Amino acid sequence: GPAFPGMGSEELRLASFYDWPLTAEVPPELLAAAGFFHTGHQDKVRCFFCYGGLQSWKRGDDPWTEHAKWFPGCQFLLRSKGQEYINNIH
């Protein structure tokens, strides 16, 4: 099961990005879709399922790609994107 079930809703995750500092650079819509919510501190986000945290986002970073890069064992990632997608990033 998810590490943080309360952030399992994509809509709730999107709402967390109201004061996201990097709107143009990495869209909240893509971050929320990829399982991440904004902690509210700097550009630190966390996945609701694996609880993996990512920060120091660079312009044009792709949330799903970074999810797979750093947390390839996440079951939300696997269910959403499939194993082939994860394997290809590695």
Binding site: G52, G53, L54, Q55, S56, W57, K58, D61, E66, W70
Partner: peptide, 4 residues
């Protein structure tokens, strides 16, 4: 991005 990087982990924290």
């Amino acid at each position: 991005a990087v982990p924290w």
